[PDB]
RNA sequence: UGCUGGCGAAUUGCAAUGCGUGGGGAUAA
RNA sequence: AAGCUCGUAUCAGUUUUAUGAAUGUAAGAAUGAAGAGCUUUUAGUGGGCCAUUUUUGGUAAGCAGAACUGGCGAUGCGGGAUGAACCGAACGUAGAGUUAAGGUGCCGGAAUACACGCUCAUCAGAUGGCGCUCAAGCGUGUUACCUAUACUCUACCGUCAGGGUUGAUAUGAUGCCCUGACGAGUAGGCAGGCGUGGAGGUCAGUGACGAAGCCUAGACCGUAAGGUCGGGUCGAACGGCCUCUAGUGCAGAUCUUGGUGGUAGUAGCAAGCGAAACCACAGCCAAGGGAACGGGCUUGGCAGA
RNA sequence: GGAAUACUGCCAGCUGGGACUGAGGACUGCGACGUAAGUCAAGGAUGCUGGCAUAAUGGUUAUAUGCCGCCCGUCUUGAAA
RNA sequence: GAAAUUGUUGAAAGGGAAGGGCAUUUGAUCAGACAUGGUGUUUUGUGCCCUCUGCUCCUUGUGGGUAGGGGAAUCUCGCAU
């Protein structure tokens, strides 16, 4: 900062692009079963919990069911199914954007997993076959036309 | 240097008509002068001709892929003209400079922060 | 167990063309079970992949992929225009092309 | 012009004294060697005569 | 939608069928037309018999042995009608035709395997009721093909060997229709119906 | 997986599909 | 091209009213254009054919002649299967979008669309081929779609036009800019550049630690002329810059000289020895490609070293 | 007698999905919103995130595939010849 | 020691034409940093630093070069760890 510009570079114009919070599509409401589409956990049924500051979604399997940890995911790489669960019993507010820094798995992450997942397992047991539904993997069979399919 | 995305318009070399068929006709560009020539009347399928439209953007002209303008250098004196334009220009050590003198040039250009386009020229380890 | 398929499979038909001129940039894609432009509107903007075996192993895999996007519809049949990064080889006229479900509108 | 440009000359020429940085942490086991084309054949055509 | 799509000429129209079979190739869609002989055209017989012979008088001058080879066998008669819409020269073609297989009748190893029909090429779905229309069979016969008989007979045999089959099968699905009919009503069922099944 | 269980999945970090040669020997042509 | 007055009310392949025997003169009529006239001088240019609209001469017909306006000429591009005369469209380099003319069975990108009727033909019909018959034909209507260098928008190149810019501009005011419009081209004209041999000047230039040259499935720059660099080969001079000068830039001339092929191990000598003529390039048929032009194209038949 | 509803047309009505582009470079101007303080979609893209050095990537040559491409020059004639 | 042209070897292609343009795949192949910090604090240790004593070239204050000692308990002023 104290070091003078040794070469003449042009300063930027005062750019007129104020950032605005992400407006998610209508189908997403906290406590919604999703289908992840890309990455390590592609074609998995995963519960949606919180919209984060970095325009992502905080999601959990839960881990006890399908082996999906407390992960972040992008909004566009998800199909949101209409089947909603109870979410109000879960304390999500502990973790945010800063939680997912990396500067073998830490014990703190495992403890946050189990505390949340037990507070979620209790509500999954209410509806029939929902536990089995989350353990299963999504796929398009012969005759499945996604422009027709209601999720 | 933060440079614009360098657009080239035409990467391919503008070769001459029938430069490939005959051997005596060079690949160096010459216009077709005859009135009955298809290249001159710009028929479909035939080779593309050099015209002013293919001209490079003024802001990004003469720039190498590194985003520097090329500049020939003979000796340490001519090198030290670019003490103020390290981000803009790049030292091109001339072809005929000996291996004895290049080690001297590369020592100075490394110190001044001048990017040399052709190091390792005549210089083993 | 059998199906791991998260893509709609469709054939790569041709390039965008007239009778005598073809633009190799824009490829025409038939998609399975798609009959109208109205059904094809769903697939607009979705990422495409052409997956194929190659001879030499590149990154611990003998299989390479060309990625691209659906741009728009093409005629009344549900045939769809598609621009890839590197254009499809033209040897692939009538080859399977994987159309994915990201990015999702739904 | 001369106000900020001599300020600018001074700036660059002071950060030319990054020479000392290169020359304190030198200790480099390389050094540029010329390849004179006479030697390039004294050490080619004599190896082929060696074999 | 199916690696191979065995078709059954029986009651089709050279041209239309063909055409549609054409497209299907140029778009990587293996095919296998069968019962070729029992194909169909349009217009009286005496017609196709001419609109052919003409194709027969063809032949090259100096050397008739190097000109338009007039294939009699139906399969072929039709294979031409097809190779006629398929650049059949540029590799893109060769690549096709290379995807075809027109048989006269229905020889293994297809006999044992499902087939289909191109609803957009049926005498009974394109030709105005009662209206002249060839039947390749005769047409071929009338102009060479020396086997209409063999296939013929050697055919009826196939229909048997099968017909017999079906029975066994039909007699099988007669049970199921019951198995479920009974096992129907119960619960687990009811439910399904609700969702639709 | 017809029904009921008990464990493991992470850190892949917010997408980048994840069967011939060149010589021997033996014997058929 | 330049100089002179002006920048206007100077006009216009146009319409209108006015006034006479399609057609004359005016407008305090419209519409468009800041591009006008007066000198003075300087290149190139003396080809027709087709089509349109008026007639004039004409008998089996065709047409023959005259005048008038276009098309090609100097001109690509989309379409008409293919084309001097048809249809659309006058071209800087691209990206995206929309269309024209023509089309959507397949070859062929695009509806084996929808709706009303008609048509059976012993070579229907619309045919370029295959093929087509409640059509893929005929007559008509309704939408949907396909795509050109066309139009729209954006960037970029250059040209032209208008303009800003100094008690000096964080770049050579023959600089740095801001705005808009434009881009075909033969003969010819004007202008800015690139290269070669030598001269003056300069770079206290490069150079046996390798100059010049030569290659190179090597790299970069310049629209291009070309310039620069790496690698290999080489062995002694050479280059940039500001200027000067000319025996200065090649594909052709039945070019000159030198060298080397195919022909050909052929003709030949009245297993060996060994040319020449000649040589744009190749050499399958059918059909169309208007023009006593089919050999390259279009559509078919076909085609194994 | 009682409402509609197509059809034509309007909205300086609302809410989405996709592609392409990001030119320019301190601030001046026309504005909107906010009582003000300010802020903003207002005289041209910013912010976050990932992939790297045995990288990432980019190129040359060789052929294949789809489409397109009459043999150059001179000299005639109306152009093809 | 160029090109035409010739042989060998290696690679590629070849069903009655090749060479060219737009685009891309495959095969072969070449590129791809003696890049290494930047900033803000903290030990010390030195010097052109503080301080004591000077000497010398010249032009206007807003000068330049260059010795002998001391001193870090003040000082980041610089450079080394």
Swiss-Prot record, chain A:
N-terminally acetylated by acetyltransferase NatA. Component of the large ribosomal subunit (LSU). Mature yeast ribosomes consist of a small (40S) and a large (60S) subunit. The 40S small subunit contains 1 molecule of ribosomal RNA (18S rRNA) and 33 different proteins (encoded by 57 genes). The large 60S subunit contains 3 rRNA molecules (25S, 5.8S and 5S rRNA) and 46 different proteins (encoded by 81 genes). One of its GO terms (cellular component) is cytosolic large ribosomal subunit. It comes from the Eukaryota. Present with 37100 molecules/cell in log phase SD medium. GO terms for molecular function: RNA binding; structural constituent of ribosome. Belongs to the eukaryotic ribosomal protein eL6 family. InterPro entries: 60S_ribosomal_eL6, Rib_uL2_dom2, Ribosomal_eL6_CS, Ribosomal_eL6_KOW, Translation_prot_SH3-like_sf. This is Large ribosomal subunit protein eL6A. It comes from Saccharomyces cerevisiae (strain ATCC 204508 / S288c) (Baker's yeast). The keyword Phosphoprotein applies. The gene is RPL6A. Gene3D superfamilies: 2.30.30.30. Pfam families: Ribosomal_L6e. PROSITE patterns: RIBOSOMAL_L6E (PS01170). GO terms for biological process: cytoplasmic translation; ribosomal large subunit assembly.
From Swiss-Prot, chain B:
One of its GO terms (molecular function) is structural constituent of ribosome. It holds the Pfam family Ribosomal_L32e. It is found in: Cytoplasm. Keywords: Cytoplasm, Phosphoprotein, Ribonucleoprotein, Ribosomal protein. Component of the large ribosomal subunit (LSU). Mature yeast ribosomes consist of a small (40S) and a large (60S) subunit. The 40S small subunit contains 1 molecule of ribosomal RNA (18S rRNA) and 33 different proteins (encoded by 57 genes). The large 60S subunit contains 3 rRNA molecules (25S, 5.8S and 5S rRNA) and 46 different proteins (encoded by 81 genes). Belongs to the eukaryotic ribosomal protein eL32 family. This is Large ribosomal subunit protein eL32.
Curated annotation (Swiss-Prot), chain D:
It is found in: Nucleus. Belongs to the MAK16 family. Its role might be as part of the apparatus concerned with the nuclear events of the cell cycle. It comes from the Eukaryota. The chain holds residues 103 to 153 of 306 of the full protein. A motif (Nuclear localization signal) lies at residues 37-42. This is Protein MAK16.
From Swiss-Prot, chain E:
It holds the Pfam family Ribosomal_L13. N-terminally acetylated by acetyltransferase NatA. One of its GO terms (molecular function) is structural constituent of ribosome. It is found in: Cytoplasm. InterPro entries: Ribosomal_uL13 (IPR005822), Ribosomal_uL13_CS (IPR023563), Ribosomal_uL13_euk/arc (IPR005755), Ribosomal_uL13_sf (IPR036899). There is a cross-link at residue 175 (Glycyl lysine isopeptide (Lys-Gly) (interchain with G-Cter in ubiquitin)). Component of the large ribosomal subunit (LSU). Mature yeast ribosomes consist of a small (40S) and a large (60S) subunit. The 40S small subunit contains 1 molecule of ribosomal RNA (18S rRNA) and 33 different proteins (encoded by 57 genes). The large 60S subunit contains 3 rRNA molecules (25S, 5.8S and 5S rRNA) and 46 different proteins (encoded by 81 genes). Belongs to the universal ribosomal protein uL13 family. This is Large ribosomal subunit protein uL13A. It comes from Saccharomyces cerevisiae (strain ATCC 204508 / S288c).
